[PDB]
């Protein structure tokens, strides 16, 4: 497990790669994979939908079981569930959605959940439909995460911009 290869080292504990996170998980077999989730743990698009489809909807049925007892998650909160065939554990983290007016300061609180796990395979948080600048999100990651995080970035153009600014 944790057979990470081909990653570019940005800091002493942050690594980056231009790759598909679902294909990486099947190749690395990580201990933890991170899901960019919403407060109701509905995996209907983005990274969440791709992970759930790779689990043949096993992630969605487990997520609904957790919501039935916990209710909605808080922005910046997280929960650890099973990783099914993709990893041992899946950490669902809810970043702030600046389109809904949620505070961008809460992105530090979202990344702080990574410090509960020794090594993670993760995407960037609060980007895309959550509306935060991906370069800003990566800045908050390298500033708050003290454990080993391996970042998969799908877009080649975005990948080159992040590398040019952080290496």
Author numbering: 3 to 169
Provide passages from the article that reported this PDB entry.
The large, multidomain Nsp3 includes an ADP-ribose phosphatase domain (ADRP/MacroD), which is believed to interfere with the host immune response by removing ADP-ribose from ADP-ribosylated proteins or RNA. The well defined substrate-binding pocket is created by the C-terminal edges of the central β-strands β3, β5, β6 and β7 and the surrounding fragments, primarily loop β3–α2, the N-terminus of helix α1 and a long loop connecting β6 to α5, which contains the short 310-helix η3.
ADRP-APO1 was refined to 2.01 Å resolution. The protein crystallized in space group P1, with two molecules in the unit cell. None of the polypeptides contains ligand in the catalytic pocket, but there is an N-cyclohexyl-2-aminoethanesulfonic acid (CHES) molecule bound on the surface. In the ADRP-APO1 structure, while the described geometry of the β6–η3–α5 linker remains similar to that in ADRP-APO2, the entire section and the neighbouring η1 are shifted away from the binding pocket.
